Amino acid sequence: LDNSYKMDYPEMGLCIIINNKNFHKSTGMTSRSGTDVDAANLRETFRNLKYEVRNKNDLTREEIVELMRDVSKEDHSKRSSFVCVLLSHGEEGIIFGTNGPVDLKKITNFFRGDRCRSLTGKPKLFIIQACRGTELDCGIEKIPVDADFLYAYSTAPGYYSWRNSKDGSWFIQSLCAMLKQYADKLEFMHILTRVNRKVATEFESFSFDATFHAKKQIPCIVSMLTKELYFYH
Amino acid sequence: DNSYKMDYPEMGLCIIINNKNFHKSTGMTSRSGTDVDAANLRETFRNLKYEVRNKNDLTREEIVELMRDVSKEDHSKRSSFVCVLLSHGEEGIIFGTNGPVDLKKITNFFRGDRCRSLTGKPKLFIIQACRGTELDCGIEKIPVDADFLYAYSTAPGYYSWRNSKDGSWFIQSLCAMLKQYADKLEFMHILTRVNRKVATEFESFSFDATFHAKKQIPCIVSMLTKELYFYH
């Protein structure tokens, strides 16, 4: 029953956390308050899952690329999987470096099944906490080279992604919580489904500005995985 | 509350918009063998106890208008909702016979705030249609946007392969996999089996290299907040 990915390679794999807080005067982008909490939460959570975590802060659109280029050239033969978290401002299909915009595709292609042979056939996980637009939700009372990729977006396509200055982002907050609670039992899709309900039901925005008040959010799981994924054997 | 409540008096409707012949003023060629999917799909969702509704060769206006009506119906005694689209497409759009429609335009109809009787209930949209023209060479209070799931036949940007006799790689595989697992596995896992099946069993064939030995990976897009079992 080759129904689920093999996770008992010597190493689980590395976890690359890119944590962008401060942005150049050129961008006229704000400071992403709360993120440092998320980065910490991710680091602890992912170490407990046994990933080789590496925290990189405030990287430039160029540095994002270069970092991604290297990791891809490494030998992930002894590694079960690859995980990468991008934390910064965004728009549909784009994450911001400290100086400018990077197209998500450009940093994921380094890892396509034909460009990173040592990751072929293993889960490439990309967790993305960033805006995919500005829409606010008001709520209501041989294999394919693109295969083995999963994108865990913090918001639906086109939408704002809410962050909290004390607790970190709703999404990364809930994800950590949920992994911490279920990584040893459930399959990853099912954990991410739990994440969804958590964000969807337990969180609501607060502002003095009625435009930005009582706003809701749903995360968006995008999976072209071919197997069930368990963080234990 | 872990999984959706699927025990209403009815499962719900399964509209299926199957477009085979297109207008002369479109350049669009006719989608041979699509009826094979439309049938295979109908039989399948019927077995899941869905109220299946077939529609052929709709224009863009017809499509918009059918969805508006169906969304205006009363879904209170229904567990979920399924809409299948079989047509030409491009990223974010599927084609009517006379021309294009933003997919968002058809789905917005069911947003929690617009189809009030479907709030809290799964909304599925299975999309067999191009999302672009790249070929894969292969290698050796709740949110109004919540409780939605899209089962696309291909990754963003990519073409989508069909077989005029046997049916599309994706729909052929969905039906096969739902037939066989709809009563063991959760939906997400069925769909993960569909990915493996389309991803490892099918390979394009052409006398021209350009179209030879091409692969395809479908793409699950989930905004559900509970697990989904076609049983209980």
Identify the burial level of A177 via C-beta atoms within 10 angstroms of its C-beta, where 0-12 means exposed, 13-18 middle and 19 or more buried: middle
- Chain A residue with minimum CA distance to B213: A142
Unique residue bearing structure tokens 């704000």 = A30
**Residues B199-209: b if buried by 16+ CB within 10 A, e if exposed:** beebebeeeee
Task: Show which of residues 168-187 on chain A sit within 8 Å of chain B, judged by CB atoms.
Answer: 187
Give the count of beta carbons closer than 10 Å to the beta carbon of residue A27: 15
Give the three-class secondary structure for A196. Answer: helix
Split into its structural domains, chain B has a count of 1
Nearest partner of A152 among A206, A197, A106, A195, judged by Cα: A195
Nearest partner of A71 among A56, A60, A87, judged by Cα: A56
* Cα distances (angstroms) measured from residue A14 to each of A8, A114, B96: 14, 19, 46
**Residues B105-136: b if buried by 16+ CB within 10 A, e if exposed:** ebbbbbbbbebeebbebbbbbbbbbbbbeebb
DSSP single-letter state for residue A50:
T
CA B140 remoteness from chain centre:
29
Measured between alpha carbons, how far is A10 from A14 in angstroms, rounded to an integer? 12
C-alpha distance from A64 to closest chain B C-alpha (Å): 23
The answer to whether B5 faces chain A, any CB pair under 8 Å, is no
Question: Residue B71 contacts by C-beta under 8 Å, 6 or more apart in sequence?
Answer: B109, B110, B114, B115
Tokens of B140: 């050796």
Question: Residue B140 contacts by C-beta under 8 Å, 6 or more apart in sequence?
Answer: A142
Tokens of B115: 């189809």
- Give the sign of the dihedral formed by CA A143, CA A145, CA A151, CA A157: negative
Identify the burial level of A48 via C-beta atoms within 10 angstroms of its C-beta, where 0-12 means exposed, 13-18 middle and 19 or more buried: middle
Measured between alpha carbons, how far is B219 from A147 in angstroms, rounded to an integer? 9
Tokens of A215: 């706003």
The answer to whether A167 faces chain B, any CB pair under 8 Å, is no
Measured between alpha carbons, how far is B35 from B21 in angstroms, rounded to an integer? 11
Nearest partner of A20 among A60, A74, A77, A75, judged by Cα: A60
Identify the burial level of A101 via C-beta atoms within 10 angstroms of its C-beta, where 0-12 means exposed, 13-18 middle and 19 or more buried: middle
Measured between alpha carbons, how far is B44 from A21 in angstroms, rounded to an integer? 50
Of the CA atoms within 13 Å of residue A181, those in its CB half-sphere come to 12
Rounded to the nearest 10 degrees, the angle between the axes of helix B169-181 and helix B34-47 is 20
Of the CA atoms within 13 Å of residue A67, those in its CB half-sphere come to 21
CA B120 remoteness from chain centre:
20
Residues A86/A129, Cβ–Cβ less than 8 Å = yes
- Residues in chain B closer than 8 A to A217 (CB atoms): 143
Measured between alpha carbons, how far is A56 from A177 in angstroms, rounded to an integer? 22
Give the nearest partner residue to B225 out of A117, A139, A193, using CB atoms: A193
Own/partner contacts of B72-75, CB < 8 Å, gap of 24 or more, are B72/B115, B73/B13, B74/B117, B75/B12, B75/B115, B75/B117, B75/B118, B75/B121
Task: Show which of residues 67-86 on chain A sit within 8 Å of chain B, judged by CB atoms.
Answer: none
The answer to whether A214 faces chain B, any CB pair under 8 Å, is yes
Residues B100/B60, Cβ–Cβ less than 8 Å = yes
- Find the angle CA(A111)-CA(A113)-CA(A116) to the nearest 5 degrees: 50
Gaps after residue numbers in chain A (C–N over 2.5 angstroms):
141
- Residues in chain B closer than 8 A to A139 (CB atoms): 112-113, 141-144
Residues A199/A168, Cβ–Cβ less than 8 Å = no
The residue segments making up the domain with residue A59 are 1-233
CA B159 remoteness from chain centre:
15
Q: CB–CB of A220 and B221 under 8 A?
A: yes
Q: CB–CB of A204 and B141 under 8 A?
A: yes
Nearest partner of A170 among A220, A221, A222, A217, judged by Cα: A217
Of all helices (H) and strands (E), which one includes residue B127? strand B123-128
Own/partner contacts of A40-45, CB < 8 Å, gap of 24 or more, are A41/A168, A41/A172, A41/A173, A41/A176, A42/A15, A42/A17, A42/A85, A42/A172, A42/A176, A43/A17, A44/A176, A45/A175, A45/A176, A45/A179, A45/A180
- Find the angle CA(B195)-CA(B150)-CA(A230) to the nearest 5 degrees: 45
> Which residues of A are marked as active site?
89, 131
Q: What is the 3-state secondary structure (H, E, C) of B8-65?
A: CCECCEEEEEECCCCCHHHCCCCCCCHHHHHHHHHHHHHHCCCEEEEEECCCHHHHHH
Measured between alpha carbons, how far is A196 from A218 in angstroms, rounded to an integer? 6
The answer to whether B199 faces chain A, any CB pair under 8 Å, is yes
Measured between alpha carbons, how far is A205 from A213 in angstroms, rounded to an integer? 5
Structural Rg of chain B based on CA atoms: 17
How many residues can be counted in chain A? 233
DSSP alpha helices (H): ranges in chain B? 34-47, 60-72, 103-107, 169-181, 187-201
- Find the angle CA(B149)-CA(B155)-CA(B157) to the nearest 5 degrees: 120
Count of CB pairs separated by less than 8 Å, A with B: 141
- Count the helices and strands in chain A (H runs, E runs): 5, 13
Measured between alpha carbons, how far is A7 from A233 in angstroms, rounded to an integer? 6
Give the three-class secondary structure for A66. Answer: helix
Unique residue bearing structure tokens 């150049």 = A24
Measured between alpha carbons, how far is A148 from B80 in angstroms, rounded to an integer? 29
Q: Give me the resolution in angstroms, 1 decimal.
A: 2.8
Tokens of A129: 């906490």
Q: CB–CB of B225 and A196 under 8 A?
A: yes
* Cα distances (angstroms) measured from residue B98 to each of B56, B59, B128, B132: 13, 5, 18, 19
- For residue B18, give the CATH number of its domain: 3.40.50.1460
- Structure-determination technique: X-ray
- Residues in chain A closer than 8 A to B180 (CB atoms): none
